[PDB]
């Protein structure tokens, strides 16, 4: 017999991920820069690794959309709503998607691409939005050499160790 977990995590420590489209804003290879980047903010202080896909099933399935998705959070035009992703579990769990109505780019011009999925990806992981103006996982975007907050090292170890 079996039981589910109680806390929303991953049970393997070894996860793979798929870019499915990308934007026009940016290069291929910036996004795919952008994106690993992020996955180490993560890797970097847990022990888990992310391993990239290029089809199939991934635990992290990355797509950028408009308006209505394929889920329940569509998006909304230029501004507002940047990303959303949802925890870990089965079948869309994992899954980040990014609005392709913004303006994504490497720089502090538009919306920066890695600092927003390093974001989404703590909600990939299990990390819920955090109360302290500092953090990552803080649920307003803001611009910033990026180290990850105290705040943000504590929720993911109590998670992954
Ligand atoms: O929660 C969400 C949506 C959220 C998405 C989102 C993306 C990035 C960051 C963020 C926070 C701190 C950082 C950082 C990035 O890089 C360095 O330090 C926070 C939230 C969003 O789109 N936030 C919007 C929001 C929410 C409330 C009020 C205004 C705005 C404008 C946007 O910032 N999905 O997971
Ligand atoms: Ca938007
Ligand atoms: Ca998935
Ligand atoms: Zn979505
Ligand atoms: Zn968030």
Known sequence: ?????????????????????????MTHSEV???????????????????????????????????????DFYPFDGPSG??????????????????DDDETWTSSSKGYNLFLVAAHEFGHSLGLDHSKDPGALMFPIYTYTHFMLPDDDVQGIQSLYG
């Not at 017999?1 to 804003?25: E, Q």
């Open 1 to 25: 017999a079996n039981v589910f977990p109680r806390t929303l995590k991953w049970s393997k420590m070894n996860l793979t991920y798929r870019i499915v489209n990308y934007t026009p804003d």
């Open 32 to 70: 795919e820069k952008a994106f690993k980047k992020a996955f180490k903010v993560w890797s970097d202080v847990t022990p888990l690794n992310f391993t990239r896909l290029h089809d199939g099933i991934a635990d992290i399935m990355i797509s950028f959309g408009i308006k209505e998705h394929g």
């Open 81 to 98: 709503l940047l990303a959303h992703a949802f925890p870990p579990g089965p079948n869309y769990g994992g899954d980040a998607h990014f």
